[PDB]
Amino acid sequence: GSSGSSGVLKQGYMMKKGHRRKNWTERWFVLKPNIISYYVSEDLKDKKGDILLDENCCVESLPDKDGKKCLFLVKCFDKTFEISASDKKKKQEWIQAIHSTIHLLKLGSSGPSSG
Numbered sequence: 001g002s003s004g005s006s007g008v009l010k011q012g013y014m015m016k017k018g019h020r021r022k023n024w025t026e027r028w029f030v031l032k033p034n035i036i037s038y039y040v041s042e043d044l045k046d047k048k049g050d051i052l053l054d055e056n057c058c059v060e061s062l063p064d065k066d067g068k069k070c071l072f073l074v075k076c077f078d079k080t081f082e083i084s085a086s087d088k089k090k091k092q093e094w095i096q097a098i099h100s101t102i103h104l105l106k107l108g109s110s111g112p113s114s115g
Contacts, residue, residue, distance in 0.1 A: 005033075006033075007032075007033075008030045008031060008032055009031045009032065009033055009097060009101060010029075010030075010031035010093075010094065010097050011028070011029065011030055011031065011042065012028075012029060012090065012094075013026050013027070013028060013029075013042070014026075014027060014028075014029045014038075014083050014084065014085065014086075014090070014094075015027070015083065015084040015085075015086075016029075016038060016081075016082070016083050016084075017082035017083065017084065019082075022066070024068075024084055027039070027040060027041075027048070028040065028041050028042045028043075028044075029083070030044065031094070031097055031098060031101065032053070032101075033101060033104070034053055034101075034105065035050055035051060035052060035053050036050070036051040036053055036074075036081075036098065036101075037049070037050045037051070038051075051074065051076065051079070051081055052076070052079075053098075053101055053102050053105060054076075054077075054102065054105055055102060055103075055105050055106040055109055056076065056077050057074060057075070057076040057077070057102055058074070058075055058099065058102060059072060059073070059074045059075075059095045059098045059099055060072065060073060060074075060075060061091075061095065062082075068084055070084075070085045070086070070087060070088050070090070070091035070092075071084050071085070071091075072084075072085060072091055072094070072095050074098065
């Protein structure tokens with residue numbers, strides 16, 4: 001079958017919510033197997049940020065607001081990421097992939113040395 005795959009799992013144009021201002025702006029997204037980056041466009045030249053995926057991090061479905069449909073947001077340790085989908089296909093197809101992507105990390109969880 002397939003053994004040893006590195007790269008992005010999902011990619012498409014999504015609308016990210018700029019915490020700074022209550023507005024939506026189309027932006028490229030790169031759903032990684034162990035992370036989630038988002039570039040201004042589908043060029044991957046000007047990175048904006050990275051969402052360290054982990055058992056802790058998860059995705060949830062949001063209601064309808066500001067005249068939006070199929071909204072969703074990701075809740076991480078302390079950081080957050082609010083994204084908006086176009087149709088039910090993307091919204092789901094995304095949340096599903098994101099959720100699963102994390103589960104994989106749950107399988108192998110190592111206890112970090114604190115103190």
